[PDB]
Amino acid sequence: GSMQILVTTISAETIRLEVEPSDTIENVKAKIQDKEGIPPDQQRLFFEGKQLEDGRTLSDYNINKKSTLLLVVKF
Amino acid sequence: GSMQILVTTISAETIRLEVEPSDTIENVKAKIQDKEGIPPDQQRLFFEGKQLEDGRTLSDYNINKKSTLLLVVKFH
């Protein structure tokens, strides 16, 4: 149109979570809901590029102390 | 204690804005409030690394058609 401009809107935060190696990623998503207020269904967890899927644990993906996890959310 | 992991929470979206080259940054910030719902003083605008100031126009920073602007917004 007249002059169409693009605005790259960014929002970012780093949340620390006290978890057990026995904790399922379902339980990890539940801990994020208490900390921020995002439902587990719309949450997308990542580690080493691989999308963390429910039914498995943090030990299965070999996640230990001081591990960087990636959470991608809407708007 | 037992195991303390870090979760890098990211949220991103691109907003399309019909603006005039005569428009000031305070007017562009007002247009973002209508599109998303963020107050103009709590939003930081950028172009070519330089932080865009409320007083100056889009012509002053040489912003034209198909220009990518950066808006950094608070967590929640």
Author numbering:
A (entry chain A): -1 to 73
B (entry chain B): -1 to 74
Give passages from the manuscript.
A multi-step purification of UbV.XR resulted in the isolation of two distinct fractions by gel filtration chromatography. The earlier and later fractions eluted at volumes consistent with a dimer (UbV.XRD) and a monomer (UbV.XRM), respectively. UbV.XRD forms a symmetrical domain-swapped dimer in which β1 is flipped 180° away from the β sheet of its own subunit and is replaced by β1′ from the other subunit. Whereas residues 6–9 in wild-type Ub form the loop between β1 and β2, in the UbV dimer they extend β1 and participate in hydrogen bonding with β2′ and β1′ to form a continuous anti-parallel β sheet across the two subunits. We postulated that reverting Ala10 to Gly as found in Ub might fulfill our criteria because only the main chain of Ala10 is involved in interactions with XR, whereas the side chain is buried in a pocket on the second UbV subunit. Gel filtration chromatography revealed that UbV.XR A10G was exclusively a monomer during purification and remained a monomer after incubation at 4°C for 1 week (data not shown). The UbV.XR A10G variant showed no evidence of binding to XR in SPR assays and did not stimulate XR-mediated UbcH5B S22R∼Ub discharge. Taken together, these findings suggest that UbV.XR dimerization is critical for XR binding and stimulation. The β strand domain swap in the UbV.XR dimer appears to be a unique arrangement for a Ub-based dimer. Once UbV.XR dimer has formed, no shift to monomer is observed, but the two dimeric subunits have some degree of flexibility relative to one another.
